[PDB]
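Colleagues,

Please find the record for the four-part complex below.
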Amino acid sequence: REDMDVINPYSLEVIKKIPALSREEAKEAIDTAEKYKEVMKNLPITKRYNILMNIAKQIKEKKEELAKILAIDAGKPIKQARVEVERSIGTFKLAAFYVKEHRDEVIPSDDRLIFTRREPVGIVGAITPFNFPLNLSAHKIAPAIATGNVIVHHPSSKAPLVCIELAKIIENALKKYNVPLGVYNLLTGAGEVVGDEIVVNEKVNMISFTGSSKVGELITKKAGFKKIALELGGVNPNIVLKDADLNKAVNALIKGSFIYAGQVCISVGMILVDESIADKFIEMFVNKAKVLNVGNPLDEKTDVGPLISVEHAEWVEKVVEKAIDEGGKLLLGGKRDKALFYPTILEVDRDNILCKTETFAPVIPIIRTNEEEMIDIANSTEYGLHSAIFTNDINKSLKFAENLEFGGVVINDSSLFRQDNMPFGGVKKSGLGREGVKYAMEEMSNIKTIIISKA
Amino acid sequence: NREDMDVINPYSLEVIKKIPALSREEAKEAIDTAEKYKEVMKNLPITKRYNILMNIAKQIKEKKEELAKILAIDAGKPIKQARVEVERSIGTFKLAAFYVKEHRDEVIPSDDRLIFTRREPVGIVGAITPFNFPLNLSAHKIAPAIATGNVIVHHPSSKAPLVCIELAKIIENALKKYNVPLGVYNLLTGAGEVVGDEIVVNEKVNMISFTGSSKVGELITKKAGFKKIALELGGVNPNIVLKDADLNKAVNALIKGSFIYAGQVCISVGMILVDESIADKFIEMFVNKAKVLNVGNPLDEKTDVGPLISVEHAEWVEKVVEKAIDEGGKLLLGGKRDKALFYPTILEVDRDNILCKTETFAPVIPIIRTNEEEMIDIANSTEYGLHSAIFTNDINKSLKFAENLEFGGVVINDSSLFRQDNMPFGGVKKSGLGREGVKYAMEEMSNIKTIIISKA
Amino acid sequence: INREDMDVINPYSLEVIKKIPALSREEAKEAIDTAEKYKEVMKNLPITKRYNILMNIAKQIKEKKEELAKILAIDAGKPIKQARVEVERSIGTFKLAAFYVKEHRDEVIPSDDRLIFTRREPVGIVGAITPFNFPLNLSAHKIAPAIATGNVIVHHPSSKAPLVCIELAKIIENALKKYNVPLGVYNLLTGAGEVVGDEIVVNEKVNMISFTGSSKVGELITKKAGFKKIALELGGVNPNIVLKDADLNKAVNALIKGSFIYAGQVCISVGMILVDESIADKFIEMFVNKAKVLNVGNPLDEKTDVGPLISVEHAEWVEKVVEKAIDEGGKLLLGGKRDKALFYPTILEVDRDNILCKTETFAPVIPIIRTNEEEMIDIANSTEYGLHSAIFTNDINKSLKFAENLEFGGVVINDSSLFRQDNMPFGGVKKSGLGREGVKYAMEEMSNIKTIIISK
Amino acid sequence: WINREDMDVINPYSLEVIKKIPALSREEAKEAIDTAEKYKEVMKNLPITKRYNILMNIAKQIKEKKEELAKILAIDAGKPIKQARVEVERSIGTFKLAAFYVKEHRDEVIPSDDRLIFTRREPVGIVGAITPFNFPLNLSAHKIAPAIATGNVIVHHPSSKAPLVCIELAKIIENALKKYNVPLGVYNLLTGAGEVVGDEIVVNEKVNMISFTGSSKVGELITKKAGFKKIALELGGVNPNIVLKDADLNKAVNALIKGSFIYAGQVCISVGMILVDESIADKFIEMFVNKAKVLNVGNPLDEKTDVGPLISVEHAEWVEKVVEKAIDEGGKLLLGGKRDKALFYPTILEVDRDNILCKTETFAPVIPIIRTNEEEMIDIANSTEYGLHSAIFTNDINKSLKFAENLEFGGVVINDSSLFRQDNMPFGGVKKSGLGREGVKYAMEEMSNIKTIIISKA
């Protein structure tokens, strides 16, 4: 069927039309998935390894094609798209490694052998975002397959095309190794229908959701008796102490601020800079931001592409307007061409709307402050995903690292840093559970404790 | 200081004393207060946590016989079993002390970056504990919570709260000794549906750790909201006896599993599935051992089986036994009651019997004779998945059953009742979320922080 | 170099395949001095570069699989189907090393006001001395973890089948060049074991010795190595136990594999079979009948099950051991025949006192002892060795009792002693070894821990 | 033999003979090992609960005898009483930690299709423990506690320079064994000449593992004589402590005073040299000498004593000669350089990188200070044959990490001296300073062998 328009966020053209499943169709797919739980649960290690490795092989073989899809559909600059594709290859490969290597444990006992075994949770409901639709899908699908789960997967309608390609890739791997196709199910359509059904359905055993904090919170209220993993967003504070290497902090913060036009859960949300160096930092940072190439994601020279929709870009514009109304000083940008939003920098105080709002936009509030106020400002939000500190001081770096109420603390690089094999996630309203393949596999399985009593 | 709620001796039915019952508004105030102490708990040094935990254990040891007597009087637990529970609780606190010092974080390899993890408290842990092992099951929530730097709001079951009140005084003594504000640990007594519910629902509580009925656990998942959730629920635990089982050993093990604490344990034997070829011999042997059990006063040293926790429960169990007999269940022993004192009761039934899908929390044992190829299916046929057991000397069959039994625990050659306190413990399906055992509970009661140091 | 000093022999035809360099001690010393110059380069090689080199080695091996397999057949006398399996394993070993460079975990230890963490660093120069029998995968098991852990390598391969190691050395050189690493980080040193291998053992610049081969040589190494880390993978007379309740068809098939894979020239090959008296006749008949039909001949033939022993010299010696075994009262049941180095599957029934029960023959010569259960553990543990043991039984209690009481680095239940999953920790106790292999385990042997303490 | 009075035991402060103890012949050592062999099965099969109980009871007895044991350290080892108490407290902790690891140590399961693969740790057999004079109670505990925990029989030679606390510990172990009905033959204290009794433990083919703590010279000879045994060595070094120009000087001085002068410098991780940036060298030296000046040097039984005597007059005389040589080579004496029998006073010299003190482990309160530039420091620090502990004082993130990664040592301490050891951390040296790691959990791994068990499924 051809139900739902898929849009190129740069040109605004309809790229194509895809199926939008009804709630009853979503229920049907879940019923089908349930029938294959036994097949997946019993799939040998060698078979899961082979499937995961073959998925990585196909992605590698179609790397440029997949990167182009990310550029056209997600608006992702082609150089950045290639990086995401490369990461997705790594993710499937690492899950293949862990099928073979994941360790269970033996616990000492007099006259008993006590050991653990991990078994699938059953049906994993994977709900993936528009921004890194390929690698973030890989971060749910790969550990799910690794742990013998059946999958129902709803991708974001804002950039579904790479996920459709991944589903075909998965289907090929499954066919190659004689596994029924019903073990993996891509369900496209409205989030509030298909996504909602995955969350609510009593046959689904676990929800793994990456996306907005608002939606994540709603899931906790509607999911019922299921395991729940949430990877949400935040307003990620990046702190520049008076002793920081300023050139290196600027370069790091340009990346953290403007990669994928700020549409990353760990994008820079606010910069707190010591008053003594604030003028110099601000000048250096604005000057570097000025020279970024803003435009067509398909162009090799493009640094910053469009936001995912005009509707979102319009919303960002109003937020920047509100920020200026509250006394924010515009230092760069604040301009918009349809969905193409230009790098925008303001100096604001800690009470500004931008300090409390995740904009998913290339909009950067800078707060000049004393060291004594920084931790309090950094911790002042309802979120707690990533934070960062730039300093050369051992004592200060450790004090900040301990006291920052965040799932991740980065020293001398921006909040945007994630090494794919590290445990990754947020506290407060920013998440539940940790991702990264090893960690996701642990969430996507249940422990069985086996006790053999000795005569 | 309020005398609101009766506490009952389930053997004599006498009111032992009256304790406070907090209103919802009083529970909210207590949670608000606890919130104030999150920072002090979070920053308590390792040495201080260690010292607090060891001193709790020391105090429990000192009062061991006194605490055991309270379990007998208040929970109806035979004194020999009460002493075992107290000893376990000492171990639980000491193990938490060990882990505060020994729990390991990790380093992830990276070119030109130092990446390592750190565990931090979840914040306020809401601990809701059951009447059946109210001392050690409280220890299994409190000890790891203190170890991981959490503030605690704790609601104990009203059916046997007295030992929890004594433990609270003990914790208070330890906190005073090491100059920690008392507000870091809070015992909130009263109606489960008022105080326990408020702990579950309140937005300031960061994590719920509940042990008790499956029905209540299910409801908690719908009402908790944005919180970490650990649930230790129940089940109808199938115990499987194959053709080749050592029958003497299986009988002895299953007597314990069936009748310890009058079957009021989440991992108590809920059904026995026995091979047809040995069913007659097994059943005769099993009934004959159950016949000689001493039923009576929990304070008596020779007592094997004490009362159920309430008359109300005993009356309900009686009804279920009646219904089981209505459906064709064959009464082999017991089926008699003296107020809350319920006698060991054994029936032969088929897989469709009400007892095969009802958690009775009672000394009532359905036995199904069947064939091997049916056993896994019957075992897996409930909505629950806590513990299962198999008695066999066959390697291939033991592994087949171990893999295929849909349970959080599978016990080979001992009953479902087995739990070593330092093992990961918990259920699948409607029997739980998360694992207990101090090391595992600590992992649930903390969040990971990933720290990345970028090198030149 | 380009010198043609030492004959390399095809053990089937006994023809000289070619001549290779035989390094002098002074040339070995010179090579070790070279390796020393590159310790700093290797120690600082980034993770990505180590990963890339190891994956590229696996890629090239895969691309040359059939060629490498043919070399094993011609040089080691290994039947071609078995040769392919070795090559396949070696690809996996390099790949697994690649993944552990990325995933290996260090730890963080709790401390008030201090961050304490570990860091693994290379031992420095790893001296690898590899055997003739699995020269490719056993070289992979030393080289792959060495590179992963940032060590320089000096490697002496067995002169009895050095050709595949010369090919692996070229593959290593290609990978090093591709990623701009000096070739001096890996050095293949061919020649006499007692000259070149000995220099590696004795040289004070070598930091660790990893040796796989004869127990005699391994013992010598402990006396000659001095102040170095030492890992030894030696042999044994591996006992395989068949209890009266074993699945006989399965035990026979498993034991045919364990007895006759690579003509018994494996450190974990079946050294003796102990069989319960009650089933001894049936077992022996079944085992002899399966052994009878094995195809003995040219390893290049796809049909061949059993190729030649590695030398005429060794085959002559085995023949004398068999003669002595017969002298002692051994009963010849099959074979005993020899054609140059081609030794036919040979089976004797003997008693526990026979020379075969104490002698590692590295040959297709299988002593069978009929006995009772209670004597089995004592017979099995009666040697100076302790590599692998196996037991065939369906009995849980007996399997657990034997597993605990067998004095061996490995205990295999319901498969023969020959079993080794490449990712399991592998090695021996008593005179059979020091340390464990398998990539993750070798990486630990080939690194030193650094504890770093940051005081706050 | 228990009644024999063969060998003098000396108080290093008064030089008085405290008492005379047995010295076993090689043949008596052989017999003790033969007898220990007979109890290998008993120890190997001792239940977890029994091992736990024995370990906890040893800890309980040490705690009940704390003051007495501390006094023995003062009198026999010359250890200031305040430091003796600390050692005793650590030893209680070591036995308790072993108790918890008997219960908590984890084995692993490895994935396999249709196979259950798991590991089991089993004892090495007979552990030959050879312990030093300097921390004779806790360093004995660091070998005994893990050995018992892992089901090994023990033959234990304590240093004859301070054996009395080890005789006391042996009685304590005997009491615990008796209490829990274990034969006394599972643990054997063998006193006498190191070159007789220690040598026999090293060479005897029935001993399965050697764990030795002491001089690097003796450690090296063990590697040449042990043969086919597992070997763990905890040796010494000349431990470099580096003070960068951005260091907190007050903190560095306090930390280095402890590291330099605790137990009169007779610690394997004692400060061996201080490298200090040229730019701050004068200020640091003045502060360091001034704090060292006010240390109380005297009778270890006095509560006020900071520094007691060296373990022997022989050693003190040798140290005197080394200081003389250091001065001959151009070393500038800043403090001390004086001896009263075995009582050696805090001694500080400014020297260059080529001075004898930069290459010599003195086990004495003698501290060479070398002023240099930052870029020379790693090379000077790494220039010895040893590699136990190093330290760096700095507030700079990048520099701390650079030094931490490039210092060729088993331990690197940032902002405390080389003397730091948390008992639960893996502890040991590279180069000539060791093999293996101690710390209960780590020693348990060294003192056991892995068994891999594979259950093949149908």
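Residues 79-102 of chain B form the longest helix (24 residues).

Comments are welcome before we finalize the supplementary table.
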